[PDB]
Amino acid sequence: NAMTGPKQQPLPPDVEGREDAIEVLRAFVLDGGLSIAFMRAFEDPEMWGLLLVDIARHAARSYARESEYTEDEALERIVEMFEAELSRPTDTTTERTQ
Amino acid sequence: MTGPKQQPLPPDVEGREDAIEVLRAFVLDGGLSIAFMRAFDPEMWGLLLVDIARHAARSYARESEYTEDEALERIVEMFEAELSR
């Protein structure tokens, strides 16, 4: 196609034109990994909890579509993979200011 | 300005036609509006969840009495409890 950039997601329709909508995060898969953009604000721990739950459940639904797993089994598998990765030591930052 | 406060592309994805946006999430009206890619590896979703949880823990520690380690335990507990509910 004629696009010169990445395969982006469009703004959700309920966000379009809304001055009060703030983008929390954008995540891209690139070179066998992830590149993520986060907003500066924290807001509250519950929002991050909601975001995690929404992503996990969405992933489980999609995984169950594309596999032999039920949605429950898919979610269990995703949580197992999450836990294995969470266990990795974080032993191994830059800033730009103007 | 008069529209949504967007995040720019990370510099490492600019011009990368092979890079794929997994999701964009907006906070609005006290909730979350998320655009997800249509295509589905499960491991990528696992990693994304870890990256978000880790980031949330660091941000939570900056705004609370908790250390990052304590914050991470709280966030993960919260997350897993809701999934099992």
Side-chain angles (χ1 to χ4, degrees), chain A residues 1-39 41-98, chain B residues 1-37 39-84:
Chain A
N1 67 32
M3 307 286 69
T4 55
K7 184 27 216 293
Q8 296 181 74
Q9 278 301 299
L11 299 177
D14 70 331
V15 157
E16 289 185 276
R18 291 294 291 267
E19 53 264 66
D20 50 325
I22 307 165
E23 191 151 34
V24 174
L25 93 166
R26 303 189 68 171
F28 289 80
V29 58
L30 173 78
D31 294 328
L34 289 171
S35 178
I36 303 164
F38 289 110
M39 67 177 183
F42 171 57
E43 314 217 335
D44 50 79
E46 299 83 0
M47 186 210 65
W48 293 100
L50 176 58
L51 180 59
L52 287 167
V53 167
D54 288 349
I55 292 168
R57 289 207 190 275
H58 171 83
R61 280 174 53 92
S62 304
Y63 193 11
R65 273 205 333 256
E66 309 293 347
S67 81
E68 311 312 283
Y69 290 133
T70 61
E71 283 172 9
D72 286 344
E73 292 166 346
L75 185 62
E76 166 67 15
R77 290 294 332 265
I78 288 163
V79 175
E80 292 168 6
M81 287 176 259
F82 165 80
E83 287 202 355
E85 183 61 38
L86 187 63
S87 299
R88 192 187 301 282
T90 53
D91 317 324
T92 66
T93 84
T94 58
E95 300 198 10
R96 175 67 192 172
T97 182
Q98 293 149 230
Chain B
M1 308 222 139
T2 57
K5 288 23 183 168
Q6 297 184 52
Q7 287 288 122
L9 297 179
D12 61 358
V13 312
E14 295 172 20
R16 289 290 301 269
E17 297 179 27
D18 57 321
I20 301 173
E21 191 150 29
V22 178
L23 65 81
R24 303 182 69 160
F26 291 77
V27 46
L28 177 63
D29 293 341
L32 287 165
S33 186
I34 308 171
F36 293 104
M37 66 178 183
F40 188 63
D41 201 276
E43 179 64 27
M44 180 275 287
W45 294 92
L47 177 62
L48 179 58
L49 293 162
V50 170
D51 290 340
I52 294 170
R54 292 203 194 279
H55 172 80
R58 290 190 288 270
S59 295
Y60 189 11
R62 287 164 50 202
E63 307 297 346
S64 76
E65 61 266 48
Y66 301 112
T67 66
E68 173 185 351
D69 286 341
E70 289 165 344
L72 185 57
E73 184 166 9
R74 291 177 67 86
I75 288 164
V76 174
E77 187 277 332
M78 164 180 46
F79 173 48
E80 295 206 7
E82 176 56 40
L83 291 185
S84 61

